[PDB]
Design a protein around this nucleic acid. Structure first.
Lengths: 628, 71, 70, 55
RNA sequence: AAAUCCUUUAACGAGGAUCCAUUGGAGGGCAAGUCUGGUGCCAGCAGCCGCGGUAAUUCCAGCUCCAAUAGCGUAUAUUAAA
RNA sequence: CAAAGUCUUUGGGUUCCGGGGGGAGUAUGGUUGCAAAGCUGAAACUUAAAGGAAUUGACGGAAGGGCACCACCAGGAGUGGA
């Protein structure tokens, strides 16, 4: 407690934090980092990115290319730094979302006369929702105008971008010295540590070779040679490629770096005893002939029609909460067979181990999720496994890929490869909290077949949408509500949070249009969804606290079937039913308040609901996106 | 058969379980007085130390209630 | 938890349903409430009305005029 | 105990905005707020109908 | 210095869905709704008092209105009220 | 209340001392004492009231009166039993 000793404490704290920062900066880019990787996204159409990249290219270049795309290595010892540029087109939703989830600094190129473009807006909302590693804006046509329109064009840019990107300066590119300034900029930049990527180990694919087992098998050894950017990739673990499912690999080896900072041997084998294997599901499989019983007891455009019927049902289930018109011919206790009423929706119990389908025999339920996650992340952090470290230019010989993967890479599509943590390939019940972007106003029903990006995956699925409360019973939603945040739920592979939740929908022929976006809640089948049904009525005889209501049933013993379930009333009154009277649907009901003639007596019925089993892993190849 | 049924628990998923008389004299009264002296002294040494003990105990419990306020 | 000293803090989110905006481990500009450190009338032992969630405010997210990076 | 999250926001019948014309903005609003109060005034016995006298 | 802006000026440039004005509020302090619909001690509002347990002057939306107005909120230090 | 007066028409000298209520006369330190304890003396946090005079009398588990066979006594008829 003095002038000197507390300045000394300030000195110790500065030493601690600067040591931490110089620990985390040198190990990304350079003589330990793999390279520093920059992805390039223009937005408009007027950007001639060959002119951009040829201003940007120069140091020493090392020019790779692909069939269509053209990524390359860049090296300068002057800054002692490795860049790896990779160019992309917006709208190419598959390619951009597959290689900006493993990119490490995103460079947005912009036209001078306006900000985003609509295809770029689409990709921009996608990249916002799956996590920006680091953005850095740029423009190209500013030198072509003298000072007047130059300054005013920059002001129009900073006004047209600060409604989306609130604070950033526009580093212009006209000269190759502007490219030098841009590279000096992108060398020293605070990398937002994306929390999903660091908890695993992921390779990019710099080169792909293929050796088939037999060529008619169309299965064979894949050869991914690239760097390692995550944790220490262990060899007993599995591997996933983001476009073509998950599959277990055979050989890791470390050939030399083809491109150093300045100018067949393997370290590990498989052994299958410890190597976890591909068990995607549970691997275990004198009455008279005349008289009745009475006296005997005394003894193209159909799609638009479907759309308009969906808008009708969103009106009839959004003007109204969950109103259901009553059946008339079938006995109304049979069609509502497995319905039971709760007195209070929050409080009254409901056994979570009661009515499990035949498909709940094919899931892995965690007992304690949070501590198992802490144990797995604790083994990730403070341990060292026997596999190769970060930065190691390694090749993986993967045993069991098909050939069309190799052909899609020879097109120019990027492959990635991230390993799995223990219990990440098995299927269970996934719960995603999610909201709706105001880009699409299309109705999205309950069991719509959609496409998910839940944490570096790509799969068609069929959810059930829910209220998002931290209680036991959660209500089923019957449409995607345009402004609340809901919970979708799907049979799917299990994935440890955090993870971004993209959802898009086929408009027509591969036009994946974005609808929903969010993050990954607790994954467990115990969260049971409760589907509600409101049965309506009308109080056509009104006495003091007792009323006769019709149009809610049509038999008599239906009321004898739904007898203990309490009514409720839009004016707040909480009564419950007495005897029925009619042979048609009619009943007397006790109440607490007096009943208005402008009333709608209505009861509630509940069941447990659960999603359908669709985990078709393949996703159809998207087309370039355009405006509606 | 009206608002209740069987629905037993069957088939679940794969759970990955984690006094002074007249005739006394000098040194006869005084042994009794000195015994009362040592009784009173050791007894109030006890009382002082236990008041300090419950001071410590009240203080640590109100620290825990402060912690429960904040956390 | 804050950054700049390591103190842990309870803070408040103003509008309805805006807890859905925030996920764990996100940069939140915590701002205080107005009675200089005293609690609000209804809420016991809560000091601080959070404004910003990852460099955008809650008054834009509550009106939907912007979107939230992560 | 986190009970519910956002129950009253998205469960209103989401009534969108109607169409009007603009206000006069700047000085002409002050010309209106002067003439609406102190020129075409009605002589009033108790002054109970306020500027938003809505039933 | 050489320019840009400012000033001076040729030519185009005004019918209101435009060349469009927002930020807060409408129980009291405190200026202005017992208007209409939803939610129903929940979600929430609120600087304090209080509201909301089903006809809600406070919530959430529209419409109207208020104060300021190209500026207005909120947090914090501080001063007057003290 | 003959001072608890000569005080916004605010200045005769002069000492101690109070700034919402709790936390608290607790900590902790110094000091005195053989000891119990005495003197001086916090803060973290919490709460919108705690309090002071007077003022009505729903409630009396407070007391007195006064009435009634939709009260009792003395009794009748009973009902309640089938």
């Amino acid at each position: 407690l003095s002038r000197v000793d507390q300045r000394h404490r300030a000195s110790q704290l500065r030493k601690q934090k600067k040591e931490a920062v110089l620990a985390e900066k040198r190990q990304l880019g350079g003589k330990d980092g793999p390279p520093h990787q920059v992805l390039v996204v223009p937005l408009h159409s007027r950007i001639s990115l060959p002119e951009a990249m040829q201003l940007l290219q120069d140091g020493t270049v090392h020019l790779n290319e692909l069939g269509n795309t053209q990524n390359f290595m860049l090296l300068c010892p002057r800054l002692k730094h490795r860049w790896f540029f990779t160019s992309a087109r917006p709208g190419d939703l598959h390619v951009v979302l597959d290689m900006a989830k493993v990119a490490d600094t995103i460079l947005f190129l912009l036209d001078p006369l306006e900000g985003w473009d609509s295809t770029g807006d689409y990709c921009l909302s996608c990249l916002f929702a799956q996590g920006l590693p680091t953005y850095t804006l740029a423009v190209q046509g500013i030198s072509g105008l003298p000072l007047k329109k130059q300054i005013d064009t920059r002001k129009k840019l900073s006004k047209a971008v600060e409604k989306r990107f609130p604070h950033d300066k526009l580093l212009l590119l006209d000269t190759q010295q502007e490219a030098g300034m841009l590279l000096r900029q992108l060398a020293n930049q605070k990398q937002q540590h994306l929390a999903f990527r660091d908890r695993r180990a992921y390779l990019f694919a710099h080169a792909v070779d293929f050796v088939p087992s037999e060529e008619n098998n169309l299965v064979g050894t894949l050869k991914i040679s690239g760097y390692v950017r995550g944790q220490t990739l262990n060899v007993n673990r599995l591997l996933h490629i983001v476009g073509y499912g998950d599959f277990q690999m055979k050989q890791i080896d470390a050939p030399g770096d083809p491109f150093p900072l300045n100018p067949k041997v393997l370290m590990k084998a498989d052994p299958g005893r410890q190597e976890s294997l591909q068990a995607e599901v549970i691997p275990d499989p004198k009455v008279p002939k005349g008289t009745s019983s009475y006296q005997a007891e005394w003894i193209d455009e159909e799609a638009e029609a479907k759309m308009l019927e969906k808008y009708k049902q969103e009106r009839l289930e959004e003007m109204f909460p969950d109103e259901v018109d009553t059946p008339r011919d079938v006995a109304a206790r049979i069609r509502f067979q497995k319905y039971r009423g709760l007195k209070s929706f929050r409080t009254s119990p409901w056994d979570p181990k009661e009515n499990l389908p035949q498909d709940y025999a094919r899931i892995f339920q965690f007992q304690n999720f949070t501590n198992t996650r802490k144990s797995i992340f604790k083994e990730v952090e403070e341990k060292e496994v026997e596999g190769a470290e970060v930065g190691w230019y390694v090749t993986l010989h993967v045993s069991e890929v098909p050939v069309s993967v190799v052909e899609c890479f020879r097109q120019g599509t990027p492959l990635i490869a991230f390993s799995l943590l223990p219990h990440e390939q098995k299927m269970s019940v996934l719960n995603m909290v999610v909201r709706r972007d105001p880009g699409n106003t299309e109705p999205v029903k309950a069991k719509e077949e959609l496409i998910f990006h839940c944490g570096f995956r790509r799969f068609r699925a069929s959810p059930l949408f829910s209220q998002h409360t931290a209680a036991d019973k959660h209500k089923l939603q019957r449409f995607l509500t345009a402004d609340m945040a809901l919970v979708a739920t799907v049979y799917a592979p299990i994935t440890f949070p955090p993870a971004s939740v993209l959802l898009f929908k086929q408009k027509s022929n591969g036009m994946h249009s974005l609808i929903a976006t969010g993050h990954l809640m607790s994954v467990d089948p115990d969260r049971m969804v409760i589907k509600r049904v409101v049965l309506s009525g009308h109080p056509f005889k009104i006495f003091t606290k007792m009323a006769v209501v019709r149009y809610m049933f049509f038999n008599r013993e239906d009321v004898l079937w739904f007898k203990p379930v309490e009514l409720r009333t839009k004016w707040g009154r909480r009564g419950h039913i007495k005897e029925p009277l009619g042979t048609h649907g009619h009943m007397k009901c006790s109440f607490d308040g007096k009943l208005k003639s402008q009333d709608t007596v209505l009861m509630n019925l509940y069941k447990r609901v659960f999603p359908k089993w669709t985990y078709d892993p393949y996703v159809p190849e998207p087309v370039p996106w355009l405006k509606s | 058969s009206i608002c209740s049924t069987y629905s037993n628990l069957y088939n679940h998923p794969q759970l990955i379980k984690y006094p002074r008389s007249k005739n006394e004299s000098k040194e006869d009264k005084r042994a009794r007085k000195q015994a009362i002296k040592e009784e009173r002294k050791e007894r109030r040494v006890e009382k002082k130390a236990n008041k300090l003990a419950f001071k410590l105990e009240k203080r640590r419990q109100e620290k825990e209630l402060l912690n429960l306020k904040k956390n | 938890q804050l950054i700049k000293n390591g103190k842990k803090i309870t803070a408040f989110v103003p509008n309805d349903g805006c807890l859905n905006f925030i996920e764990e481990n996100d940069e939140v500009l915590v701002a205080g409430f107005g009675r200089k450190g005293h609690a609000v009338g209804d809420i016991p032992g809560v000091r601080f009305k959070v404004v910003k969630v990852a460099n955008v405010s809650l008054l834009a997210l509550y009106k939907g005029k912007k979107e939230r990076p992560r | 105990s986190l009970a519910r999250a956002g129950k009253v926001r998205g469960q209103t019948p989401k009534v969108a905005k109607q169409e009007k014309k603009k206000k006069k903005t700047g000085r002409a609003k002050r010309r209106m707020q002067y003439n609406r109060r102190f020129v075409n005034v009605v002589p009033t016995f108790g002054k109970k109908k306020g500027p938003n006298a809505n039933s």
